[PDB]
Design a protein around this ligand. Structure first.
Ligand SMILES: [Co+2]
Ligand SMILES: [Co+2]
Ligand SMILES: [Cu+2]
Ligand SMILES: [Cu+2]
Lengths: 151, 151
């Protein structure tokens, strides 16, 4: 499993396609998201690839190491913690992320899991509430999609 | 992964939810599909979990052993060859299968791949034409979805 793809869709105007490519011991995440309100939005990998109930069924962030919510560069982060994507004035966000924690194979494999883009920005668990240590206070799930094997 | 799910959707009335469960050394496929034309419909695992171009981007049938298209009971078949589902008068198909070739882990894993329900009945590789040895003349893909890890 060296390439994956995800199509983000939801109940609103938010849409996008994310590409995953394994490079060395990292995964390179690229793509774009549209129909986003300007600014930052939490971008995470949720535990389940279950769409039965929309984005709600994806569960919490992928967290095999049973840690607290954090930023991508933090040591105490969920594996699904990719931090933030930033939409321009016209509501477009270009995704360009490199991450050593997520993987396309084995234990930390994200294939068959769900990618979610949130309503508010991710505080990286520095909010001071409890919530910050769980969710980053990213709010609602604007769009999501199952990560699948790509050519 | 021992439990998986798939939510089928398309540009039609057809939809459904199919579940996969690892029971013993085999995989049990259950669920239901609606909005189908009465009769048989090809039901296969396509290779790519790429939904960027609808079900089209799912590629051909999952076929790691490089065999020709066949029926679920044939020696010569694609791993993705689950045969046909049958729709009742009221256009409802109930899925209930056990398969010795598909898996939820390892080289035969269908996780991250695409379940597709076709417009026509599957030939089971017995049509007499090339197309038979490929898709069973199952025709267009009415609905599909990427198989994700479930709770
Ligand atoms: Co998190
Ligand atoms: Co086939
Ligand atoms: Cu999240
Ligand atoms: Cu097919």
């Amino acid at each position: 499993a060296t390439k994956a793809v995800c199509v983000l869709k939801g109940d609103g105007p938010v849409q996008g396609t994310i590409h995953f490519e394994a490079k060395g011991d990292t995964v390179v995440v690229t793509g774009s998201i549209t129909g986003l309100t300007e600014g930052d939005h939490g971008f995470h990998v949720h535990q389940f690839g279950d769409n039965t109930q929309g984005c709600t069924s994806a569960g919490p962030h992928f967290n095999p190491l049973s840690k607290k919510h954090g930023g991508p560069k933090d040591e105490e982060r969920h594996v699904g913690d990719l931090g933030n994507v930033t939409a321009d004035k016209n509501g477009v966000a270009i995704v360009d992320i490199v991450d050593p924690l997520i993987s396309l194979s084995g234990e930390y494999s994200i294939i068959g899991r769900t990618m979610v883009v949130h309503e508010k920005p991710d505080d990286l668990g520095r909010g001071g509430n409890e919530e910050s240590t769980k969710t980053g206070n990213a709010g609602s799930r604007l769009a999501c999609g199952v990560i699948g094997i790509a050519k």
